[PDB]
Write a protein that binds this ligand. Structure first.
Ligand code: MG
Lengths: 162, 163, 162
């Protein structure tokens, strides 16, 4: 109705909440890039996206990468790979390009040289979204000599811009 | 207020947001079951449930189980044990019975055989809800030889169905 | 119409208050540990995000002293909140109930000035009382140590609306 404003909407002939606001599902098939202490690699991932109320959730699957540093960045390039009609701008946080420490959590990453991984307890958080790239910080928990990393499934969530 | 549709509701004579939508508390007294690589066991938990906006949160307490595999499933049976007037259908995700990797997190589980536990950081996620049973994947982090598992308190959350 | 927050006038129609959807603040305050006769405090500068019916407290990494196998981490919201946020704004929707909310893994580095050993502890929101939020931190075993390296931790819970 012309006298209602999204997320408020006509719901079977009355005043309700837009179903689209309550739950929207999408997908990202795209590139995750790691950078830290001169180490750089990238990997393609298939990830569900769920937008629920004023939050976005990016459900990353387990993946394998190469060497990581004590501290580093994991970057999700949303500039391509989003399933239409979801656009890059739809992934911008409500704090826009502010630098933050949002949703900080433990992530166990298995470091190896081909053999039995040693799992390190690292600290991950959403740090910054900039020009359609979501940057996550991954640091702490110490490290070992390794050439491969086994990354767990990780859900990345934050407040979405409206 | 025939013109209104939940979660929009009459609030002190005007148009507001239903308090029931904003916060609801409940309880599940029920059975958590583990299955992985031919290992099966179950325990009872008494767990708070919070429904807040379009999310449901299941606050599992710490519990003790037996042997686990490198990878396996932890299943919560919502068919029984929900506090009235909550029903089994109330726990269906907004992605219904789709197979997902939602709310993936680290859980540290203490593995022992009567002595001091070794804590394994494993990877847990909501995988699938089917006919009132919520299936959580628990994998990764390696393992040791063990007969007993000490599970931490874990909160499991996901967007909740509304039609 | 007679609108009731968070329903509010938006651009001439009935919509959702932007304030309900996203609010960003800060808490510059004192975090106190207590367990088994151990007591210490630190200063934190932390972002607060209020999004829909949730509050998120984004604690930065900090260093403290000895911890017990089980103990309490307490956030003093009586002071330090950035105006116009007030202490009452941090009350959970379960008010002063004792709960086990948002239980998660937290890896904490225990040392005596040398290389930390990281212990996977279990943290949850336990109770808010008179402007003090009590978090429980237990499990994962322990070692003899004089210092603790705490990771960045985000603490979230449903927020009271009165
Ligand atoms: Mg106590």
């Amino acid at each position: 109705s012309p006298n209602l404003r999204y997320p408020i909407a006509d719901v079977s002939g009355g005043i309700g909440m837009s179903p689209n606001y309550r739950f929207r599902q999408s997908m990202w098939i795209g590139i995750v890039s790691y950078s830290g202490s001169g180490l750089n690699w990238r990997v393609q991932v298939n990830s569900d996206i769920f937008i629920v109320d004023d939050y976005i959730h990016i459900c990353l699957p387990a993946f394998d990468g190469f060497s990581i540093a004590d501290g580093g960045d994991l970057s999700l390039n949303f500039v391509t790979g989003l399933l239409p009609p979801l656009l890059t701008g739809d992934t911008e946080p409500a704090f826009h390009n502010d630098v933050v420490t949002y949703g900080a959590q433990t992530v166990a990453i298995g470091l190896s040289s081909g053999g039995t991984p040693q799992y390190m307890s690292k600290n991950l958080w959403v740090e910054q979204w900039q020009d359609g790239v979501l940057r996550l910080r991954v640091e702490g928990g110490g490290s070992i000599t390794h050439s491969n990393s086994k990354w767990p499934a990780m859900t990345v969530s934050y407040p979405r811009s409206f």
